[PDB]
Amino acid sequence: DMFIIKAVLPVAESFGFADEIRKRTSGLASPQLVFSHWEIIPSDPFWVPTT
RNA sequence: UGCGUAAUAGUAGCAUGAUUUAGUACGAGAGGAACUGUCAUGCCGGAUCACUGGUCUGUAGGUUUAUUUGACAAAAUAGUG
């Protein structure tokens, strides 16, 4: 009876994210959290913007 | 003289809470209203003294200090002792 998305979701930006949607809507939003591996994105974190 | 009018002017009541609605509506939950009804309350005003309190030259009674009038008596003065 279920419909599935396999969309990626950063570990940091979920901080009680799966807990909210589950309670708000049980059955019509049942997030099963399963790790895979760390995706690399084009961005360079560094302290102080120079020039 | 009475009984009246009423131009002109002034003019007064305002504000809350509890409950009823309703743990309702609303909201995934967290929470959480209103119209309406009732009982009250804050300040504002206009009166009144039945109660309660206040006051006392009612110099109304009661008590007592000092002095005076021989004593008791019953009074006086002490600016209402």
Curated annotation (Swiss-Prot):
Tissue specificity statement from the Swiss-Prot or TrEMBL entry: Expressed at low levels in brain. Expression is highly increased in glioma tissues.
Disulfide bonds: none
Disease linkage: Shwachman-Diamond syndrome 2: A form of Shwachman-Diamond syndrome, a disorder characterized by hematopoietic abnormalities, exocrine pancreatic dysfunction, and skeletal dysplasia. Intermittent or chronic neutropenia is the most common hematological manifestation, followed by anemia and thrombocytopenia. Some patients progress to bone marrow failure, myelodysplastic syndrome and malignant transformation, with acute myelogenous leukemia being the most common. Exocrine pancreatic dysfunction is generally the first presenting symptom in infancy.
Subunit structure: Associates with the 60S ribosomal subunit. Found in a complex consisting of the 60S ribosomal subunit, SBDS and EFL1. Interacts with SBDS and binds to GTP and GDP; the interaction with SBDS decreases EFL1 affinity for GDP and facilitates GDP release.
Functional description taken from the UniProt entry: GTPase involved in the biogenesis of the 60S ribosomal subunit and translational activation of ribosomes. Together with SBDS, triggers the GTP-dependent release of EIF6 from 60S pre-ribosomes in the cytoplasm, thereby activating ribosomes for translation competence by allowing 80S ribosome assembly and facilitating EIF6 recycling to the nucleus, where it is required for 60S rRNA processing and nuclear export.
Family: Belongs to the TRAFAC class translation factor GTPase superfamily. Classic translation factor GTPase family.
The protein's name in its UniProt record: Elongation factor-like GTPase 1
Source organism of this protein record: Homo sapiens
Lineage start: Eukaryota, Metazoa, Chordata, Craniata, Vertebrata
Gene name for this UniProt entry: EFL1
